[PDB]
Design a binder for this molecule. Sequence first.
Ligand SMILES: [Mg+2]
Ligand SMILES: [Mg+2]
Ligand SMILES: [Mg+2]
Ligand SMILES: [Mg+2]
Ligand SMILES: [Mg+2]
Ligand SMILES: [Mg+2]
Ligand SMILES: [Mg+2]
Ligand SMILES: [Mg+2]
Ligand SMILES: [Mg+2]
Ligand SMILES: [Mg+2]
Ligand SMILES: [Mg+2]
Ligand SMILES: [Mg+2]
Ligand SMILES: [Mg+2]
Ligand SMILES: [Mg+2]
Ligand SMILES: [Mg+2]
Ligand SMILES: [Mg+2]
Ligand SMILES: [Mg+2]
Ligand SMILES: [Mg+2]
Ligand SMILES: [Mg+2]
Ligand SMILES: [Mg+2]
Ligand SMILES: [Mg+2]
Ligand SMILES: [Mg+2]
Ligand SMILES: [Mg+2]
Ligand SMILES: [Mg+2]
Ligand SMILES: [Mg+2]
Ligand SMILES: [Mg+2]
Ligand SMILES: [Mg+2]
Ligand SMILES: [Mg+2]
Ligand SMILES: [Mg+2]
Ligand SMILES: [Mg+2]
Ligand SMILES: [Mg+2]
Ligand SMILES: [Mg+2]
Ligand SMILES: [Mg+2]
Ligand SMILES: [Mg+2]
Ligand SMILES: [Mg+2]
Ligand SMILES: [Mg+2]
Ligand SMILES: [Mg+2]
Ligand SMILES: [Mg+2]
Ligand SMILES: [Mg+2]
Ligand SMILES: [Mg+2]
Ligand SMILES: [Mg+2]
Ligand SMILES: [Mg+2]
Ligand SMILES: [Mg+2]
Ligand SMILES: [Mg+2]
Ligand SMILES: [Mg+2]
Ligand SMILES: [Mg+2]
Ligand SMILES: [Mg+2]
Ligand SMILES: [Mg+2]
Ligand SMILES: [Mg+2]
Ligand SMILES: [Mg+2]
Ligand SMILES: [Mg+2]
Ligand SMILES: [Mg+2]
Ligand SMILES: [Mg+2]
Ligand SMILES: [Mg+2]
Ligand SMILES: [Mg+2]
Ligand SMILES: [Mg+2]
Ligand SMILES: [Mg+2]
Ligand SMILES: [Mg+2]
Ligand SMILES: [Mg+2]
Ligand SMILES: [Mg+2]
Ligand SMILES: [Mg+2]
Ligand SMILES: [Mg+2]
Ligand SMILES: [Mg+2]
Ligand SMILES: [Mg+2]
Ligand SMILES: [Mg+2]
Ligand SMILES: [Mg+2]
Ligand SMILES: [Mg+2]
Ligand SMILES: [Mg+2]
Ligand SMILES: [Mg+2]
Ligand SMILES: [Mg+2]
Ligand SMILES: [Mg+2]
Ligand SMILES: [Mg+2]
Ligand SMILES: [Mg+2]
Ligand SMILES: [Mg+2]
Ligand SMILES: [Mg+2]
Ligand SMILES: [Mg+2]
Ligand SMILES: [Mg+2]
Ligand SMILES: [Mg+2]
Ligand SMILES: [Mg+2]
Ligand SMILES: [Mg+2]
Ligand SMILES: [Mg+2]
Ligand SMILES: [Mg+2]
Ligand SMILES: [Mg+2]
Ligand SMILES: [Mg+2]
Ligand SMILES: [Mg+2]
Ligand SMILES: [Mg+2]
Ligand SMILES: [Mg+2]
Ligand SMILES: [Mg+2]
Ligand SMILES: [Mg+2]
Ligand SMILES: [Mg+2]
Ligand SMILES: [Mg+2]
Ligand SMILES: [Mg+2]
Ligand SMILES: [Mg+2]
Ligand SMILES: [Mg+2]
Ligand SMILES: [Mg+2]
Ligand SMILES: [Mg+2]
Ligand SMILES: [Mg+2]
Ligand SMILES: [Mg+2]
Ligand SMILES: [Mg+2]
Ligand SMILES: [Mg+2]
Ligand SMILES: [Mg+2]
Ligand SMILES: [Mg+2]
Ligand SMILES: [Mg+2]
Ligand SMILES: [Mg+2]
Ligand SMILES: [Mg+2]
Ligand SMILES: [Mg+2]
Ligand SMILES: [Mg+2]
Ligand SMILES: [Mg+2]
Ligand SMILES: [Mg+2]
Ligand SMILES: [Mg+2]
Ligand SMILES: [Mg+2]
Ligand SMILES: [Mg+2]
Ligand SMILES: [Mg+2]
Ligand SMILES: [Mg+2]
Ligand SMILES: [Mg+2]
Ligand code: NA
Length: 139
Amino acid sequence: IVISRHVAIPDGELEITAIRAQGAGGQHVNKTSTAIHLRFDIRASSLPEYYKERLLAASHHLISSDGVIVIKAQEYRSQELNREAALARLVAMIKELTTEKKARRPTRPTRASKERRLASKAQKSSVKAMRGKVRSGRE
RNA sequence: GGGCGUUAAGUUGCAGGGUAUAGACCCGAAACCCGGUGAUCUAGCCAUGGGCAGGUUGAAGGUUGGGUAACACUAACUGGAGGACCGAACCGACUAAUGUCGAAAAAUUAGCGGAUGACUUGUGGCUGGGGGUGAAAGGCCAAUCAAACCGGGAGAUAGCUGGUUCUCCCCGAAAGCUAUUUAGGUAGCGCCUCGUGAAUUCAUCUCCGGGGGUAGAGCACUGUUUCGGCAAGGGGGUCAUCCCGACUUACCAACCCGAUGCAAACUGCGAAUACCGGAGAAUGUUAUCACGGGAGACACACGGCGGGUGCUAACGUCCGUCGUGAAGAGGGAAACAACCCAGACCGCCAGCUAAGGUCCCAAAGUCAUGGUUAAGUGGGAAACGAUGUGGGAAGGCCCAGACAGCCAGGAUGUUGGCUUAGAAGCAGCCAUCAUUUAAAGAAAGCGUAAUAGCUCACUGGUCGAGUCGGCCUGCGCGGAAGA
RNA sequence: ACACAGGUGGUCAGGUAGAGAAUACCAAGGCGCUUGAGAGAACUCGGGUGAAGGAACUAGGCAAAAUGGUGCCGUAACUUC
RNA sequence: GUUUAUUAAAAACACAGCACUGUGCAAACACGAAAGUGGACGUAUACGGUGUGACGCCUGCCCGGUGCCGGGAGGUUAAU
RNA sequence: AAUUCCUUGUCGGGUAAGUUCCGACCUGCACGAAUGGCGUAAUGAUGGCCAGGCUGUCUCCACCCGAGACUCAGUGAAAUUGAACUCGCUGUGAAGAUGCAGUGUACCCGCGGCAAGACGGAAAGACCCCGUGAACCUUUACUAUAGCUUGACACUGAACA
RNA sequence: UCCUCCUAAAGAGUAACGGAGGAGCACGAAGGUUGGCUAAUCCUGGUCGGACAUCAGGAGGUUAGUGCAAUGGCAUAAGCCAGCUUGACUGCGAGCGUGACGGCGCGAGCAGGUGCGAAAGCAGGUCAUAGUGAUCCGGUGGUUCUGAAUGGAAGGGCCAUCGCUCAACGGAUAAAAGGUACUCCGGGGAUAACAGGCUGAUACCGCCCAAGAGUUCAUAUCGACGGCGGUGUUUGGCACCUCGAUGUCGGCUCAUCACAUCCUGGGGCUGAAGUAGGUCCCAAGGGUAUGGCUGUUCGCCAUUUAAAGUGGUACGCGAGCUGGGUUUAGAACGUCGUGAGACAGUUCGGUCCCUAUCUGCCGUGGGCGCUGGAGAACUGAGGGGGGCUGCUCCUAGUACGAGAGGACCGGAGUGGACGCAUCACUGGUGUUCGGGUUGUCAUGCCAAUGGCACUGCCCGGUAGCUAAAUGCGGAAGAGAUAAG
RNA sequence: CGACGACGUUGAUAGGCCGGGUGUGUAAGCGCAGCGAUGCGUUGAGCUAACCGGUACUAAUGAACCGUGAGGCUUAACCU
RNA sequence: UGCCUGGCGGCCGUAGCGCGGUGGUCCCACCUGACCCCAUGCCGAACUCAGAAGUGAAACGCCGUAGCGCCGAUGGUAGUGUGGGGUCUCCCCAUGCGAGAGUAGGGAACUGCCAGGCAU
RNA sequence: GGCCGCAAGGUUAAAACUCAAAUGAAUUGACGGGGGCCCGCACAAGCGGUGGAGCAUGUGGUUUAAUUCGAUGCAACGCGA
RNA sequence: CUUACCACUUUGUGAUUCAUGACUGGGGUGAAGUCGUAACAAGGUAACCGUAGGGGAACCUGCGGUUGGAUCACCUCCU
RNA sequence: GCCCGGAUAGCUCAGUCGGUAGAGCAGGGGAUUGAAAAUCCCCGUGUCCUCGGUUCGAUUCCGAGUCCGGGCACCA
RNA sequence: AUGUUC
Ligand SMILES: [Mg+2]
Ligand SMILES: [Mg+2]
Ligand SMILES: [Mg+2]
Ligand SMILES: [Mg+2]
Ligand SMILES: [Mg+2]
Ligand SMILES: [Mg+2]
Ligand SMILES: [Mg+2]
Ligand SMILES: [Mg+2]
Ligand SMILES: [Mg+2]
Ligand SMILES: [Mg+2]
Ligand SMILES: [Mg+2]
Ligand SMILES: [Mg+2]
Ligand SMILES: [Mg+2]
Ligand SMILES: [Mg+2]
Ligand SMILES: [Mg+2]
Ligand SMILES: [Mg+2]
Ligand SMILES: [Mg+2]
Ligand SMILES: [Mg+2]
Ligand SMILES: [Mg+2]
Ligand SMILES: [Mg+2]
Ligand SMILES: [Mg+2]
Ligand SMILES: [Mg+2]
Ligand SMILES: [Mg+2]
Ligand SMILES: [Mg+2]
Ligand SMILES: [Mg+2]
Ligand SMILES: [Mg+2]
Ligand SMILES: [Mg+2]
Ligand SMILES: [Mg+2]
Ligand SMILES: [Mg+2]
Ligand SMILES: [Mg+2]
Ligand SMILES: [Mg+2]
Ligand SMILES: [Mg+2]
Ligand SMILES: [Mg+2]
Ligand SMILES: [Mg+2]
Ligand SMILES: [Mg+2]
Ligand SMILES: [Mg+2]
Ligand SMILES: [Mg+2]
Ligand SMILES: [Mg+2]
Ligand SMILES: [Mg+2]
Ligand SMILES: [Mg+2]
Ligand SMILES: [Mg+2]
Ligand SMILES: [Mg+2]
Ligand SMILES: [Mg+2]
Ligand SMILES: [Mg+2]
Ligand SMILES: [Mg+2]
Ligand SMILES: [Mg+2]
Ligand SMILES: [Mg+2]
Ligand SMILES: [Mg+2]
Ligand SMILES: [Mg+2]
Ligand SMILES: [Mg+2]
Ligand SMILES: [Mg+2]
Ligand SMILES: [Mg+2]
Ligand SMILES: [Mg+2]
Ligand SMILES: [Mg+2]
Ligand SMILES: [Mg+2]
Ligand SMILES: [Mg+2]
Ligand SMILES: [Mg+2]
Ligand SMILES: [Mg+2]
Ligand SMILES: [Mg+2]
Ligand SMILES: [Mg+2]
Ligand SMILES: [Mg+2]
Ligand SMILES: [Mg+2]
Ligand SMILES: [Mg+2]
Ligand SMILES: [Mg+2]
Ligand SMILES: [Mg+2]
Ligand SMILES: [Mg+2]
Ligand SMILES: [Mg+2]
Ligand SMILES: [Mg+2]
Ligand SMILES: [Mg+2]
Ligand SMILES: [Mg+2]
Ligand SMILES: [Mg+2]
Ligand SMILES: [Mg+2]
Ligand SMILES: [Mg+2]
Ligand SMILES: [Mg+2]
Ligand SMILES: [Mg+2]
Ligand SMILES: [Mg+2]
Ligand SMILES: [Mg+2]
Ligand SMILES: [Mg+2]
Ligand SMILES: [Mg+2]
Ligand SMILES: [Mg+2]
Ligand SMILES: [Mg+2]
Ligand SMILES: [Mg+2]
Ligand SMILES: [Mg+2]
Ligand SMILES: [Mg+2]
Ligand SMILES: [Mg+2]
Ligand SMILES: [Mg+2]
Ligand SMILES: [Mg+2]
Ligand SMILES: [Mg+2]
Ligand SMILES: [Mg+2]
Ligand SMILES: [Mg+2]
Ligand SMILES: [Mg+2]
Ligand SMILES: [Mg+2]
Ligand SMILES: [Mg+2]
Ligand SMILES: [Mg+2]
Ligand SMILES: [Mg+2]
Ligand SMILES: [Mg+2]
Ligand SMILES: [Mg+2]
Ligand SMILES: [Mg+2]
Ligand SMILES: [Mg+2]
Ligand SMILES: [Mg+2]
Ligand SMILES: [Mg+2]
Ligand SMILES: [Mg+2]
Ligand SMILES: [Mg+2]
Ligand SMILES: [Mg+2]
Ligand SMILES: [Mg+2]
Ligand SMILES: [Mg+2]
Ligand SMILES: [Mg+2]
Ligand SMILES: [Mg+2]
Ligand SMILES: [Mg+2]
Ligand SMILES: [Mg+2]
Ligand SMILES: [Mg+2]
Ligand SMILES: [Mg+2]
Ligand SMILES: [Mg+2]
Ligand SMILES: [Mg+2]
Ligand SMILES: [Mg+2]
Ligand code: NA
């Protein structure tokens, strides 16, 4: 229920229910609801802004069209493991969907290249000057 | 000196208890090993005969004619290969329904795959049990297969269930310790019973001799803890470089000092109760101890008290002590082993009581006296809330008039000089009755930026006689929602 | 185990339509499957039909429906021709 | 094509092809206490085992480990 | 992906909506080259997905034809079964009551039918644990052993260097 | 296995997968004896030398040390330092403590032979408790022992002593790993999975204090740090029932109950202008979606609805149905393992039985009763069924509002779903009516018919039954209340 | 299945019959045209199940059986 | 017989610290010297010996002094055996036992044998 | 895309898009870790030094209020001074 | 009234073409960047052509081919 | 919820058994070069994680915290 | 001997 030094998941918006797992187990998996179905609204949730407008904007299999982080944690057996695991997946995915890429600063050409350009310009011009038709005043 | 003996009479039957070896209280395995019967189903093979309606495609090749130096190549006709196609018999078993004490220990109905083959089938033969065979599933080997069937070892073994058969009488436990490839068995001991022997032996109570370190308490000690003083040393720098700063020596700060607590692994203190002795009275069917025969038992549960663990959860678990149930009926707690009373030898159409009860179901008080409760509280629940209602002690205000009503004044410097573009009697830190009378602020809730104003705090007038809160308290109410 | 919807090798194998030992109706031949008689309810079994819609049922078009023969025209990607 | 008769008919087994490898024929190997028989009245273009499973493109690195093959120098080593 | 936990990854397609499907991306938990890798026309009672058609599979079932079912006559079983004069509820209780407590209802008795209960019937639970139980199977568990293999001795001798 | 503390309830003992530590040794001096001595740590000065070296004095009090853990001790020291020495002896041992036993432990004194001391005296190991191993089988030495005819001897015995992380430490063998989903047998609810039960940590719900947010204002709403409960819906805990069987996910069909109400119905506050909301009381009468994906409860999504409630009922219901999943035996992929095999990891395939006796319930009768007998019609105790609601319009562009927008209250009409009834319509069916038609057999033959082929395949179709077809119902009203 | 409703010769209870309806859809035979298949006339005929209105033609027969004979006792309002 | 001192015991903080004072005929104490018995893990510091000059300074002993330590009642409280009760993770009643700390207060020790000196 | 190939590939054979060049021969030069001659304290042969220490001096750097400006490779760094 | 013809239209299956598509292979340009030096002299291993293999890339290696590659008698005679 | 190996100059690491600071890289300053490389010389780096017990001494020993990969958290 | 780049 914690992300960073300032962003905290207040846990008042963490609608966890317990469903019956999918897979093997015999007569325990049929009858012991252990898959943690974690639901976590995003819009009306009291996380800081710049989180809501980013989570809702991004497209991820967990977050629904109503804007609810949906987790189906059934990778472990007992509800303590599944609850800690679903909370871990939620923490991780909110971390990952709230980290932003750094702003690529687009560079300018080097001053060495600018002077190389101007020197090539001057060299071809120095050639072209004495190139071509010569002027005269005599006949 | 010490260990073992030294005093006693054994022995032979008979009956009985126990042990030991024999199956040894009976029934009950999975299996193991022998010696044999099985390939008339089935897996494979061998030999010898059978079966495959009908309809499709149409290869190689062959002929012919081109085309080639010759091939090559190509066209037509021909021919009929194929684990080829469609499909009946035949073989099989993919889907579904039915059937599931069926018609059938696996079928039937409708569909389905192969259907000239690595096919199918008839007759006969061969391969055999840790062996056969296997287009491999651990499949099949006579409805039986991760080692067939029959007989024998064999009554295997079974620390495991189940059962144990007539009667009466006396005594009558344990589910603990220790040890265990040991935990659900067993052995010794503790507990039971039957004998033998031995002492005031043992028990109860009283007095006396005792040692504890628990409850309690305490902080001299080990840790811990909050304050305040004491605080030098750490301390930022505004200690200025080698020397340092009366300020920071606010912070920290050991100890000390004074107090405040806490502890199972703390004790400068320390009970009750148990326990060990000594002595004595009374009582107790000698209940004590030693030896000998026979055991059972070593899965205990609850309740009270002291505790560990758990969450001061569990009808949880693990201990100590006691009791009960187990192995104890009866009365009571509606029913309810373990809670309360009480320990049933048999009979009685007798009586007194215990716990519990007395209006009716249901035996007994509509008992007596004095109170409380108004909620079915009694007859389920906490924090908390409440002018519910008894009782107490005390305090405040009161016939110089008490509290509440009542028409009603309560204010000019008080926008106060005052972030003053308002915080105006009532959004500013600051204060600022500071005159007037009995009273009245440089004032609370409102337009609150306040004038425009409201009430308001306070005094007076009537009314007149109780009133104000606060505490202890007893019984109550709300909090109090479930299939 | 039964007077058991099972299994059992070989031969003969007619007419009409059909390619035909499939199939449908028949001849020679054989049998009416060893309890019946009523009634005409649920419900089950084997079936027929269905408005409108058409997989919305569902695990899944299981089932059921549908197509289905001969002759002629045509017949794509892909290909090991 | 075959399979779990009697709940699995498949992606499982087989399969033609491929490779490794043993085997010189009294073959290897197997059933046999042995004789013998199969292999096979076969002879390396053949047999047995192993793995993969038509066809096309292919099949990369490691010999440290375990196994197999080769060595015999040395060490250790049995009966005697 | 027959391999992928996160996972319903992301993207595109398909659908109005697609955890499956198809095509890609690669972050391959844990593909990978004859214990084969990749692709592949044909084949497949093979697995997944889609569309056309078709229909009672379905909203939503309705009617009808037969065989049972039901009544009559004949023959006539079975599983099960302590006994029975065999109610509901709330509670108690070896902790999910026909039987106990309290209470309410219910004249005795059949026939058709349903199946919630009688912890219904069937199978001394195939799950789990225990047995100082068993079987098979695996292996660099232990102990052996068949077989394969070395050497000595024997059958086995001679001459020579 | 052993040692120490606590738990341990003031004799001993006393358990737990309770809380804390340690040992598997060391030392011929770290023992004995005689003699002697007394710390740690602060303060003050002193070459290096100081935070802390050895140095001197004061304070202190054992707060040091005891070879090693903890406890009990220790100053007469058991601590520290010196000289001599080996009593770290040999044979015994009154008594006693502790053990079920095996054993363990303390021991004054006696005989011998010693050390220390002047001597009394002390000394058979260390301040104590840990530092360990039963028997068997053997080894080596010694020996008044035995010695298979006799003498030897081998061997055996007694004494000394050696070899066992036999540490699973009372030690089953000198010698020991696994799979079984191919399983089998004996048992257990003594002991697990589901279900039930006890509890409620967890979960869900409510309440208390409430700083603060809310342009100001704690409460329109939310509520920080904290606190008190309730429910028995999850996950748990425990193992009470069931292991001589209680079938388990989901689905379908059938419901039933609670209210902690999703809609409808009635209210309060509102940061409620109106519509619309938010929240909190009352309320269970009725209603509460179809689809795509997945086996899914769950969820996402599309589209509706007035609403798409939360829960109990063996997380209802399989002697009602399915079997996709989970769970058999086949097979494969990834991974692990050398291998058998294994995987709450996938993937393809995979037998779901029962004739209802009782209770229950849906209907339906027989007997008898109710008092002469009989046929009718009823009263009505009591019980059951039913109770849902949208849209449009008028009220009215009215109230309100700046305008967009837009009422309450009250009427009307048409729908949705549900139920009852019926066949006049629309139809379906209608194998019992009529016709068409393929093949074939027969009626001698043409014609006409009949049989059989699913009713042969079809086209129609009467009555009846029926829904998709039509009509009708939810009331209005009254009484007594709920919140208010 | 019991049951419930109707009727049992003074009868429409069922069956049949007549008529009607409804449905199917122009029967067979005959005649004509056509070589024939077929078509046309008779001919909206024929058949018509449960429906409707009637009609004793058949069957619902006289009977027999069960149920009987004034209804307990005691108290109370009256003629007695 | 009384004072003082020495040695050895009783008891082991009422019995000890701290402050203040007193002793030197005797005893004790320091002290002289270490030549000798003897010792210093170096040193007559310690021991040891031979001595007595001086000293009561320390130490020792004696008398006041509570400043401290220490002892500490009566009551009450906690706790508890036993038997009941409850509003039962803790209390109450009856009865029995009765703390710890604290309070008033106490408290500057008492005592035995022998030896010596002093005074009788 | 076609035809061919088993395959690697071959063969037939474009366009979008950009660039004002891409090229061939030949001259002069520069360069070669190309050749051939020839030379200079270039190497070799030697002698003595620098880098090592201190100092003077100048720069680079850092600092300052400025540390004035300029050279900055041989050809600046006891340089203009 | 009906018979053949044929528009329009509806099927089913192709053909071609146009636009479009996750992702991808190359290309060109820009080029300020990174890693190398392959080529140009004997470019320091001559280069290049074909072909096959490998590698991060220029390219490297193998087989064959071309010169569009620079000196080419470095212990010698007298022949 | 732990547990297996772990916390070391500026960095990759070594390395012992109480009395360790060792290697390599890198870096700096030179040497060369026209200059950057590449090379050739010279130079020095930590108290062995915040710690908390022990010991006369902590990196070598036992426990909280960074958690490195992870290992397990399975059975009906 | 190999021995890059502005
Ligand atoms: Mg599993
Ligand atoms: Mg065996
Ligand atoms: Mg035989
Ligand atoms: Mg067929
Ligand atoms: Mg066929
Ligand atoms: Mg045969
Ligand atoms: Mg198998
Ligand atoms: Mg068989
Ligand atoms: Mg066997
Ligand atoms: Mg025997
Ligand atoms: Mg037996
Ligand atoms: Mg008795
Ligand atoms: Mg036991
Ligand atoms: Mg046992
Ligand atoms: Mg205490
Ligand atoms: Mg303390
Ligand atoms: Mg204590
Ligand atoms: Mg026990
Ligand atoms: Mg018993
Ligand atoms: Mg009793
Ligand atoms: Mg009783
Ligand atoms: Mg009773
Ligand atoms: Mg009770
Ligand atoms: Mg209350
Ligand atoms: Mg018969
Ligand atoms: Mg038969
Ligand atoms: Mg036939
Ligand atoms: Mg019959
Ligand atoms: Mg019928
Ligand atoms: Mg049909
Ligand atoms: Mg019909
Ligand atoms: Mg239809
Ligand atoms: Mg239709
Ligand atoms: Mg359609
Ligand atoms: Mg669907
Ligand atoms: Mg089908
Ligand atoms: Mg069909
Ligand atoms: Mg096949
Ligand atoms: Mg076969
Ligand atoms: Mg089968
Ligand atoms: Mg078969
Ligand atoms: Mg294969
Ligand atoms: Mg390979
Ligand atoms: Mg090798
Ligand atoms: Mg070898
Ligand atoms: Mg996906
Ligand atoms: Mg998608
Ligand atoms: Mg894909
Ligand atoms: Mg391989
Ligand atoms: Mg393969
Ligand atoms: Mg009968
Ligand atoms: Mg009950
Ligand atoms: Mg039934
Ligand atoms: Mg049963
Ligand atoms: Mg069993
Ligand atoms: Mg004790
Ligand atoms: Mg005790
Ligand atoms: Mg001594
Ligand atoms: Mg100093
Ligand atoms: Mg010692
Ligand atoms: Mg010791
Ligand atoms: Mg032994
Ligand atoms: Mg002899
Ligand atoms: Mg043992
Ligand atoms: Mg043991
Ligand atoms: Mg043992
Ligand atoms: Mg398997
Ligand atoms: Mg039990
Ligand atoms: Mg359970
Ligand atoms: Mg505020
Ligand atoms: Mg509030
Ligand atoms: Mg149990
Ligand atoms: Mg448990
Ligand atoms: Mg228990
Ligand atoms: Mg139960
Ligand atoms: Mg069970
Ligand atoms: Mg309510
Ligand atoms: Mg109600
Ligand atoms: Mg009503
Ligand atoms: Mg409802
Ligand atoms: Mg459950
Ligand atoms: Mg269920
Ligand atoms: Mg069933
Ligand atoms: Mg179910
Ligand atoms: Mg049931
Ligand atoms: Mg199948
Ligand atoms: Mg299936
Ligand atoms: Mg009702
Ligand atoms: Mg009609
Ligand atoms: Mg009709
Ligand atoms: Mg009809
Ligand atoms: Mg005829
Ligand atoms: Mg005819
Ligand atoms: Mg016939
Ligand atoms: Mg019709
Ligand atoms: Mg009303
Ligand atoms: Mg008529
Ligand atoms: Mg006509
Ligand atoms: Mg006619
Ligand atoms: Mg007292
Ligand atoms: Mg006291
Ligand atoms: Mg080309
Ligand atoms: Mg030189
Ligand atoms: Mg230098
Ligand atoms: Mg120099
Ligand atoms: Mg110059
Ligand atoms: Mg090159
Ligand atoms: Mg070169
Ligand atoms: Mg190069
Ligand atoms: Mg080159
Ligand atoms: Mg290479
Ligand atoms: Mg950790
Ligand atoms: Mg450089
Ligand atoms: Mg270095
Ligand atoms: Mg570069
Ligand atoms: Na190898």
